[PDB]
Structure formats: structure tokens, C-alpha cells
Amino acid sequence: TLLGTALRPAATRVMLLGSGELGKEVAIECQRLGVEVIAVDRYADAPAMHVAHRSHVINMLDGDALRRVVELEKPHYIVPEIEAIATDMLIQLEEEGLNVVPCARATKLTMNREGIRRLAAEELQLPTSTYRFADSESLFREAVADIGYPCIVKPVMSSSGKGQTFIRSAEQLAQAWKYAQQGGRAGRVIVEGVVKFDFEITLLTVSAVDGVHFCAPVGHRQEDGDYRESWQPQQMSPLALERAQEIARKVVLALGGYGLFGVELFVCGDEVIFSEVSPRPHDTGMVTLISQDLSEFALHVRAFLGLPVGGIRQYGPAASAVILPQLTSQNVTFDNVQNAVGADLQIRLFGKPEIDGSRRLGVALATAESVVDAIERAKHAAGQVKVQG
Template identity: 60%
Template sequence: FASDFEEFKAAVEAIGIPCVVKPIMSSSGHGQSVIKTAEDIEKSWKIAQEGGRAGAGRVIVEGFVKFDYEITLLTVRSVAGTSFCEPIGHIQVDGDYRYSWQPQSMDSAAKEAAQEIARKVTDALGGYGIFGVELFVCGDEVIFSEVSPRPHDTGMVTMISQDLSEFALHARALTGLPVPEIRFLGPSASRAVVVEGDSTEVIMDNLGKVLEEPGVQMRIFGKPEVKGHRRMGVILATADSVEEARAKAERAYDKLNVQIL
């Protein structure tokens, strides 16, 4: 952690280049950057100060971790105790989620280790609700990355993969109701609809074709504008396997016609 530019330079030197820079509060990759050379140091500091959701302030400098894959383990704390959704695999671009799928295939040792870490982290934080715990997995080794104390973007796949989505689970837990069971319905995938431009008029067109294949759904978020890039919707798909679900979501996405007026 670094609170000012001098501390930041010292942290980069201690961690080494390349390294990742993040504001202490961020989402969708805002304010995050990668330092690849010494010339990037000042630029990355500026990005973190201007792009973080909490404004200027402390930043985090992280070293790179070699891992096989990354997961989100949605962890629910309710009056009934702690429960876990099936692990979610995902792909990010520039710190922002683009694809997710459930379940991510894991061996039993790695899955148990992930649940143990998620339980420790969420027990330490306390409170009721859903937590998006992000973890790196390398073989049987699991390394904690970060946690979001709310429904997670990669967890939007649960709107089609579970009987109770991450939003329903969060609401149930927060209102003091029990979560006795989370029923997984089958292999599923999501594809984020990210729009680039500067407009208050974004049209999602050709939806008849997008939704023509069985097992495909779409959510349009109704956000009023886009400046730069913004996630404006998500395509959801379910199939007999994760691979089929991901391919189906991608086919639907390819049919979507986004117009920026």
C-alpha cells in the first residue's frame, strides 16, 4: 500500500517491474494499470488517482502471480451460516470482465482450499450478504486476490445457472432470511455487452436473432449514457456443457447490433 507518490515509487521498487497498480476502491478496471517500464510509474500513479471510485488516495501495488486460471467464488453469509456457489471461471480484458462461466472445473483439493480461504476472508469481514471472492488457482494451490462485498460482475451468469441468482441471494441474506440451499441448474455462460463511444442514445437492435436459439437470455441494464466504454448489458446462455454454453453466448453476441446515435 502507498499513500503518496514517494511511497508509491518505493513500493514499485520493492515489488519490481512489471507490477499492477490499483486504487484501494475500484470496479470494472477503473483506475487500474500495469507498469511495464520505469517510464510508466508516474503515468500509473496519475491513472490510479483519477480513476478510482473513492477518488484520489491510497493505492495498491501488486506483483504478478503465475496461475493456471482465476475464479470467483460467490460466498453467502446468512442466518443459516456460510454457503458457496459453484466456482465461476472468467476472462478479463483491461481489468474488466468480458466472459464468465459456471462451473469452472476444479479438482476437489483446490475447491476445498478455495472455500476455506473464502470462509476466512468473509468471516473476518463479517455481516450478511454475498461476497465475490476472487482467487488464483495453480494446481492445488489457491491464492487470494480480492473481494467485493456485494454481487460480483462475473456472477451475473447466476441469473441463468441457479434457482437463486446472486442478487436474490444477496437480498435474502441481507433481510435476515435463511439460505438453506443454492440449487445449481446446469452449465452456463455469460458474455458482457461493452459499448464504446460518447452518447446518451444507445440502441440494442436485432434482438429477435439474438434470442432465437433455445437457452439464451439477455439483460439490458438501462444505463442512460456511455462515455468511453461501459458495460450496458449481458447475454446469458445455458447448455449441456460449459463449452457449448460459451459458444452459444458468443453466437448470440455476434448477432447483436449496437447503434450509438
């Protein structure tokens, strides 16, 4: 592995497709290695743009626009932060010699639930919830009848809970369908049977030159489409951890390429069920910004540059808690910060230029002698922040 100096002729150039808070940490980690960084998104002054050498604002879903910026900047690596990208062009570029992280195919499979679900369940034969796809309201109903109640419906091209309904009875059928129609490319939906798990985790898995590595299990708490808190490690039986790792290894290798992946699993005692996977750093993994020697972001960077991971140090019980206000402003301020940080307590404020309703503007991080204590410390701190605008 050879790295050049950012801004010099032999520079190593990384292009970030999506410049949110997740990309922001990847940028920092690239910059820490003197890696040249070009941050791209659909809006100006996005978080990652704050710490990049240069930035561009384009239609990331536009394959031509993508090709244009790529031709213009000639990055060595293209690093997507989101699902909503012209994956078809990524494939082209990849063939054209571009390094798409982790790989263009991983990106295509995961931008639509259909690709990923069918691969895991049908091709890989991994355990998953029952599911049915539907592209019409009527077919939607047939699916539900076959799946049974309760069931959850989701748009095939969605994230963060957009257009999702937890269906308990036929009564909600109408609304569920509409709502789901509202979410996406505005068509197709997935109808999944409800898994009743003891708890859920995100197994941060790194595929690198020196193999597949696993971070300690991350537990999380969801609240209406968004993670609210995450913690590590999440206690699990030895058998469950082994099955979890088996599943994650298979999925990442199947998706292919080097990088860190966010493997979402449901745990039922000693049993593990595959949910979905981020072929990149996971929002819940932000706890790793305090709980490990190498964050999930440092890890992704390390893996994709072709460097060996060697190993990951976990410092003990930790948690994250989102700072998720609800307001409309283009000049957000954060007061009472003196009460949100301290011993074994930190915060991150993303620099997002504006908000119009609910938006994750930062995160509180804490360590403690138990996850229970960390979670409370972290929730408390996030809550202390006075968001005004």
C-alpha cells in the same frame, strides 16, 4: 421472520444505495416478496429505479445527504451496490439501529484496498499477492523496487480497473503513477506483485442464518478492467475447491453480517490465493441469472432478510457475455435482438439512460453441455446485438 406488504403501514422497506444492473436484480427479488424498495443513485433513471417503488438522486458520498434520505424514507435495510459510499455515516446509522447489509464494517473495510488487504493478509493470514502501499511518487518507486517486475499498481479507492497499470519496466513508472493519480478521490496506491495463476474465479459465498453456503465456482475472462465473460462451473481440483471454500468462509465471517459476497481468487493447480471481495453480488455472478434456481441476487435478498438458504441448485454448464458498446448517446437502441435469443440463450438489457464511450449496457446468457460451448453461444449472442444511438 415477518414481512409486511409494500406500500402498507407494516411494509418492509429496503433502501438500495446504487441502482445499477446489480441493484436492479436485487430490486426485482425484493419486489417478488412484496418488499418495499427505494432506489438511490447519483443519476436519474438508473436501472434499479425502473423497478422501485420510489427513487432519489443524491451524493452518495455525502454523509449528510445519506442521513437525510435515510431519515426521510426510514428503510429497515440499507443495501449498497458500490464501494463509493459514505461508509462513516453507514456506521453511525448502523449504531442508530439501521441494518446495513451485510454490515457497516464490511463496507468500510472494502471501500479501500488498504482495509481489506491488510485484514486478509495480516489479520486473517490468508494467502495473497505481495503488496506495498505508497502515497507519493517517490514512495511509489521504492515500492516497485521492492516488489519487483512485473507488478501492477492500483489506486486504493478504485474499481473496474480504473487507474491500473500492469508494470513491466521502470520505463512505465512515470505514466503508471500519473495514471493512478487520475483514478480516485483525486492519492494512495497499492503496488502488487503479479500472481501467475492457472485461472481466476469468483466464489459466490452466502452467509445466512443457517450458515455459509457456496455457489459453484465462477470462472471469468478480463479485458482491460472489465470482465468480458464468466462461466460456471469452473473446473478445479478437490483440494483447491476446499482451500477456496476455507478462504472464502474465513473472509465472509470476518467481514460479518448476512448477505452474498463475491470472493475473488486466483488458482494455481491445487493452491488458492485471495485477491479481493465484493460484500455483495458480483458482476461476474450475473451468469447465475441462468445457471441456478436462485440467482446471486435472490440469494443476497434471502440471506439479508434473515431467511435460511437451505441450498443452491446449479443447472449445468453456463456462461454470460457482456454487451459492452462504445458510443455516445442518450437514446440507445438495440436491433437484431431476434438473433441474440433462442434455445438456451437469453439476454438482459439494463435500461441505462445514456452512454459516453464504453459502458456495460446488457448481458447475453447461455447454457450448453460444456462451459466452452456456453461461452461461445453467449459471446456470439452479445455480438449479434446491434447497438445504435
